[PDB]
Design a protein around this nucleic acid. Structure first.
Ligand SMILES: [Mg+2]
Ligand SMILES: [Mg+2]
Ligand SMILES: [Mg+2]
Ligand SMILES: [Mg+2]
Ligand SMILES: [Mg+2]
Ligand SMILES: [Mg+2]
Ligand SMILES: [Mg+2]
Ligand SMILES: [Mg+2]
Ligand SMILES: [Mg+2]
Ligand SMILES: [Mg+2]
Ligand SMILES: [Mg+2]
Ligand SMILES: [Mg+2]
Ligand SMILES: [Mg+2]
Ligand SMILES: [Mg+2]
Ligand SMILES: [Mg+2]
Ligand SMILES: [Mg+2]
Ligand SMILES: [Mg+2]
Ligand SMILES: [Mg+2]
Ligand SMILES: [Mg+2]
Ligand SMILES: [Mg+2]
Ligand SMILES: [Mg+2]
Ligand SMILES: [Mg+2]
Ligand SMILES: [Mg+2]
Ligand SMILES: [Mg+2]
Ligand SMILES: [Mg+2]
Ligand SMILES: [Mg+2]
Ligand SMILES: [Mg+2]
Ligand SMILES: [Mg+2]
Ligand SMILES: [Mg+2]
Ligand SMILES: [Mg+2]
Ligand SMILES: [Mg+2]
Ligand SMILES: [Mg+2]
Ligand SMILES: [Mg+2]
Ligand SMILES: [Mg+2]
Ligand SMILES: [Mg+2]
Ligand SMILES: [Mg+2]
Ligand SMILES: [Mg+2]
Ligand SMILES: [Mg+2]
Lengths: 157, 197, 127, 106
RNA sequence: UUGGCGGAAAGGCCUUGGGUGCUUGCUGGCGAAUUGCAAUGUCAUUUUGCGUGGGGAUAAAUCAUUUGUAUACGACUUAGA
RNA sequence: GCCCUGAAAAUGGAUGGCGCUCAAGCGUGUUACCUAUACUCUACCGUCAGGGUUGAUAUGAUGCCCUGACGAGUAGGCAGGCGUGGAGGUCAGUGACGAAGCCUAGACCGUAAGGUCGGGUCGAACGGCCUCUAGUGCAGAUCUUGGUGGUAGUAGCAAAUA
RNA sequence: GGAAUACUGCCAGCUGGGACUGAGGACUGCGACGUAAGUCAAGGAUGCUGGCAUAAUGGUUAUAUGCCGCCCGUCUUGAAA
RNA sequence: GAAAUUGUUGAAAGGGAAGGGCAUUUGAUCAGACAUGG
């Protein structure tokens, strides 16, 4: 032959995995993520956009709204770890929000009419609350950018 | 933090200033040094005149041409102290040194641009009072430099110009104050005040 | 088409080229350990060629594995090939260089049939 | 919005090194605005980018990025250490670099 | 566009007159999504070749030959419509 | 105590260099920071040691499996292996539909000696495995024979009248 | 006279940020919390989401960049000599 | 029909040798993957 055949050959039986022990416990957010808190997004498509926190969801994310009619950002998912939690807050008492969950955003282009109509519903309430305080509406439309002489490790936000 | 930093090297101590500049380059900050002839050196004039003469007496015996090169101008004296603190024989070295310009007097592009000082190299700050020291431009004509009077002449001329520039500017900021006043005490004023502004 | 096997680590991938094989043509690249009394290599001064020692010995569990997943087995004909039937997630075939163009169509065939992998198809391959 | 920047400006100073041996695997970054280690703690873990130009287009782009994060403080004056996925080119000592505000705990 | 000033490397600076876009000084009407939870994003300026439409300008150096204020050879210095 | 004198040698030079004067000097003290092949934890290789285990039960019992510790090296000792000519045996082994040989910043395997493969070139023979055997591995020996460079288009080709 | 505080030490006191690792591969062990059924951070990582197609990534190679590297062989206490 | 050595073509680098080590940029090159309803 071209080579003396092996004397062994291992077992082609792919074995099972050991009973792993990693429960999946809930994620407690940091004490600065109160729903209705204005958030600075730091990455992705709407980086720099100032934005209002709506709801923790089960894939650890945050429900964001913009609101759309203020700065163009939709009801959206966002990861806590790419967000500066500012120290301004809007009341979120008038806002439904309980219909929104993971499966809402589920990958099942065009835009559903539901998304569009839900937007207006949630938005108009937030916009209603935003207007009770001056220059908050503008502040939301302006983008955040660090300036010459800003040192993040000092700034309050 | 700035693209270029221009240093009025007046009243500074040669090697300390040299030192900060050599680091500033190696980290990629473009630097121009100006008024290199009003650079200071600790110790009385004679000592440094003597020290320089040592430097002079060093030359390749078989061909003084390839010998250590004794540059006599203040800029060039100062550039020596700097090169000594950079690894100039490597590309990184050369690159750093290409971010540096040194001038005697302050020539035209810079003459109308802000210069800074380097407090940790300021003679007046560092040197103990009473302690004697040396002026570079005076050290230089001492050991051969040819342009001490030509620079002083162009400097006095720049100084006239720069001060009428300043007289006019100071007269303008007066105006904006006496423009301001009206709104210095306005309602918006008070609101800004509430914020540190 | 192959087993588990952990992430194949290689530890030291460059060749080990005999000292001064880059100096003189007469000195082959094939490794040879420096013996001479002063030699900087044998004495291991900083900044020289590293020498082979058992520390580079590869993981017992991913050793001999080609990137695919299988130890390669030299195969010179059909019967040679057919040793590998049961052990198809473990080995692949390399058709010995000296196998005629016409015979390699056969072994490629039977392999196909048997689900056996071939490391070097495209043999003396037309087109 | 003349300003669009969501990062702090950095310079690439050195590899980690002794007097005569360098470790390419770690880079010493100098974060603008950071004087002391106490400050530089803010940025630990935060992602760095070096951004360079090329000739060959890739993702329809002639601009590229080398990514990595700030990992530990260095020395007494706010210099900080960093590892990148690959390892910065050393031609880049004294080049600009970018330190982002994420991962955030603000 | 009206005046000026700048020669240290000035190649830049102030000033006069309108024209034009923007104006977040203020008050409204719209837009943004789906780039899907970060990757991937504003394009800066060098050269260099080609393309067009306009304005423009229309030579010299070398080889060779020659001089000998020059010369080992190159080089130097002359001369030739 | 520090500083000054005492203090003179031959290329131009050395607190390592620059340069430093309430030091970047001398004495002392307080903290922080940088960094070896060392120390601590973990993966992997090997070596050594201790243990489990063919009880009827497919594929290595010089094996599989569990555990701990250790790793510098000339001269030198032993061990495990790689490569070459020829011999017994066996793959009813490869081959003119292309052996061997050669070339190849092409591929894969081995810590390594090396092995394997593609493309090219070629043209009649040649492998693997168990063993046997030695005229068995080169960088050196002012080694042997042969072949070739740099030197270099260089020294030079100027005695004897033309 | 009654306190505070510093300094030092202890806690099987509570907590934030950052880094490297994830070997093993059914079960068997020691526990923990539970009234219980059960649950667990208890003899070694899982879960969720996303990216990649003449590509993400990895190997080789050339070059550049930072640091580092004297000529081997030999006799010798000592060799780049 | 090897090597030394050489011409040509093509690629690259070169401020008083060249060559080597760790690391990465940049270029060239090369891979390992494959099977899921139409
Ligand atoms: Mg808007
Ligand atoms: Mg001084
Ligand atoms: Mg050096
Ligand atoms: Mg010795
Ligand atoms: Mg370091
Ligand atoms: Mg200039
Ligand atoms: Mg990112
Ligand atoms: Mg003459
Ligand atoms: Mg003497
Ligand atoms: Mg001397
Ligand atoms: Mg002493
Ligand atoms: Mg001291
Ligand atoms: Mg002390
Ligand atoms: Mg180690
Ligand atoms: Mg040993
Ligand atoms: Mg053998
Ligand atoms: Mg043999
Ligand atoms: Mg023989
Ligand atoms: Mg047999
Ligand atoms: Mg052949
Ligand atoms: Mg024949
Ligand atoms: Mg034998
Ligand atoms: Mg013989
Ligand atoms: Mg012999
Ligand atoms: Mg030989
Ligand atoms: Mg020899
Ligand atoms: Mg020898
Ligand atoms: Mg000839
Ligand atoms: Mg001749
Ligand atoms: Mg002769
Ligand atoms: Mg595992
Ligand atoms: Mg690929
Ligand atoms: Mg190379
Ligand atoms: Mg060196
Ligand atoms: Mg060197
Ligand atoms: Mg002797
Ligand atoms: Mg020796
Ligand atoms: Mg022939």
């Amino acid at each position: 032959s071209a080579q003396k055949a092996p004397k062994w050959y291992p077992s082609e039986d792919v074995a099972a995995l050991k009973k792993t022990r990693k429960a999946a416990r809930p994620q407690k957010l940091r004490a600065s993520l109160v729903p209705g808190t204005v958030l600075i997004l730091l990455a992705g498509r709407f980086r720099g956009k100032r934005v209002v926190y709506l709801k923790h969801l089960e894939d650890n994310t945050l429900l964001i709204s913009g609101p759309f009619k203020v700065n163009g950002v939709p009801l959206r998912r966002v990861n806590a770890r790419y967000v500066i939690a500012t120290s301004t807050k809007v009341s979120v008492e008038g806002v439904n929000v309980e219909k929104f969950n993971v499966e809402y955003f589920a990958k099942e282009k065009e835009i559903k009419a539901e998304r569009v109509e839900d937007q207006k519903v949630v938005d108009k309430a937030l916009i209603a609350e935003i207007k009770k305080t001056p220059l908050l509406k503008q502040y939301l439309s302006a983008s955040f950018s660090l300036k010459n002489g800003d040192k993040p490790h000092m700034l309050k936000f | 933090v700035e693209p270029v930093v221009v240093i009025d090297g007046k009243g500074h101590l040669v090697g300390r200033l040299a030192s900060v500049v050599a680091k500033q380059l190696l980290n990629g900050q473009k630097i121009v040094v100006v008024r290199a002839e009003e650079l200071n050196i600790s110790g009385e004039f004679f000592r440094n005149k003597l020290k320089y003469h040592d430097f002079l007496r060093k030359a390749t015996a078989f061909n003084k041409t390839r010998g250590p090169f004794h540059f006599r101008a203040p800029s060039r004296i100062f550039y020596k102290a700097l090169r000594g603190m950079v690894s100039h024989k490597t590309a990184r070295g050369k690159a750093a040194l290409e971010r540096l310009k040194v001038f005697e007097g302050i020539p035209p592009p810079y003459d109308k641009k802000k210069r800074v000082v380097v407090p940790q190299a300021l003679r007046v700050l560092r040197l103990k009072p009473g302690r004697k020291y040396t002026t570079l431009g005076k050290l230089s004509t001492s050991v051969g430099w040819k342009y001490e009077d030509v620079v002083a002449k162009l400097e006095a001329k720049r100084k006239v110009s720069s001060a009428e520039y300043y007289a006019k500017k100071r007269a303008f900021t007066k105006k904006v104050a006496s423009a301001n006043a009206t709104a210095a005490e306005s309602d918006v004023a008070k609101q800004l005040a509430a914020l540190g502004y | 088409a192959s087993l588990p096997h952990p992430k194949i680590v290689k530890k030291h991938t460059k060749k080990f080229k005999r000292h001064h094989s880059d100096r003189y043509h007469r000195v082959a690249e094939n490794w040879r350990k420096q013996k001479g009394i002063d030699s900087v290599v044998r004495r291991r001064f900083r900044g020289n060629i590293s020498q082979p020692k058992i520390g580079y010995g590869s993981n017992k569990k991913t050793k001999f594995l080609s990137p695919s997943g299988h130890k390669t087995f030299l195969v010179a004909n059909v019967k040679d090939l057919e040793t590998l039937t049961m052990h198809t997630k473990t080995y692949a075939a390399e058709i010995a260089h000296n196998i005629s163009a016409k015979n390699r169509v056969v072994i490629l065939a039977r392999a196909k049939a048997l689900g056996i992998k071939v490391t070097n198809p495209k043999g003396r391959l037309a087109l | 919005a003349e300003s669009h920047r969501l990062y702090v400006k950095g310079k690439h100073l050195s590899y980690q090194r002794s007097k005569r041996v360098n470790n390419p695997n770690v880079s010493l970054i100098k974060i603008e605005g950071v004087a002391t280690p106490q400050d530089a703690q803010f940025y630990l873990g935060k992602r760095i980018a070096y951004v360079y130009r090329a000739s060959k287009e890739v993702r329809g782009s002639k601009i590229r990025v080398m990514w990595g994060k700030v990992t530990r403080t260095h020395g007494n004056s706010g210099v900080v250490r960093a590892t990148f996925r690959n390892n910065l080119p050393a031609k880049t000592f004294g080049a600009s670099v970018r330190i982002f505000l994420y991962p955030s705990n603000i």
